[PDB]
Amino acid sequence: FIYRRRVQFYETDAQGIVHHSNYFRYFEEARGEFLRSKGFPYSKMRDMGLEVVLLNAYCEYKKPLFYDDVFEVHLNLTFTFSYIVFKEDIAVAKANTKHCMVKIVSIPVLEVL
Amino acid sequence: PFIYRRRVQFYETDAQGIVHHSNYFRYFEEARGEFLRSKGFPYSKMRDMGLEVVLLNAYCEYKKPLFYDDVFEVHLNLEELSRFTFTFSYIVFKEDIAVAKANTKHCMVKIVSIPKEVLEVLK
């Protein structure tokens, strides 16, 4: 899955770069659109009582992201997601998050992944 | 006048090298939190009671900026306490200088009358 996004000004800090905590926010955005494209948006899910919980997360920072920069988050597949952030086709960061469902249950949903 | 002390965190600044304007409202929220706590009836207690404080409007004037690691104070003042709403005015001080002033107006939902016990701690 490919998620496209532009760096907003408030997402940067005095260092002139995107605060690292924001990357986990970009990742969450990628997941939201990934599920939506699968007809199982994180939205209709909750209606069923299914609430995706985060177990752990990791992100490696290789290159800075500046205000207004255009980039994409490449998302791929308890279930974990892999993430690669590209800016002009250059890997600026790599990450991964681990999740699970609580209604704590087995993965019903399973193949929209 | 209720004084709230705080220091600027790095993630609170933006590329311009100053605290993002949207974070001031968060500073005012923190001020309100300690204010109500100092009265012995924190907002969390109100919530576990089914009460909810709803923000009606917020305003902020920015005179001088705040930088990372700056020590500053938020001087909160109860402006108006009516039957259904209450208003707070704030002044942000850095080294005793007014760098910004603001105000917020709130109502409560359980729209209901501000309960007696809350009225008591807002005075």
Next chain:
Amino acid sequence: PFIYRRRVQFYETDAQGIVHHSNYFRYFEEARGEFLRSKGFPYSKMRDMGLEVVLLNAYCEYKKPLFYDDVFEVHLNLEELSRFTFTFSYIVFKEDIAVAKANTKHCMVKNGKIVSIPKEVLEVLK
């Protein structure tokens, strides 16, 4: 009457189940950003021209909340344009309903001083 479209992200909400009031100003900033860009003077470019848009004050009236995943629109207009300041007004629409009203007042700074709004930025605004 510039329209800015956006959907609510989960991290922008709080425990009360709604978008935290402080994020609205972030939405208005994004809207200003696309406004300036759509006109040819994206803020980034202004920052490179040595121009800085400084905020003087901002107001927001909250009528109804925004929930996670709500699709909404920010409509921005130019309220005033003097030689030193310009003011934007905003209306947050959800299903064609005014969910919030607001305004922000700005000035232009170059080096370390407020300078007359250059004709360059001037044409774009009005």
Next chain:
Amino acid sequence: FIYRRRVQFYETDAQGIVHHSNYFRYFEEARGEFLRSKEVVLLNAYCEYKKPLFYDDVFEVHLNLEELSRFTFTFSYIVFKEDIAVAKANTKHCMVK
């Protein structure tokens, strides 16, 4: 080493808990006060969430230097809510001028 803090309302989500991205912000505050006690670049970060933190919960962040070299240092983090460790984490850093 020991960083005390309380959860602010805006730091929580619609699911009623502190958003996971905020934990890194707490680690930055702890890290900040640690240094004061005594250009930095973040290389990588990780966090394990065992128990959630709620609005205005008082919690403690135990900071510890775990690794050190000529080019990078690493801090370990443990978040305590009462007598229970609700989150484990670490971050590695370097410096460039």
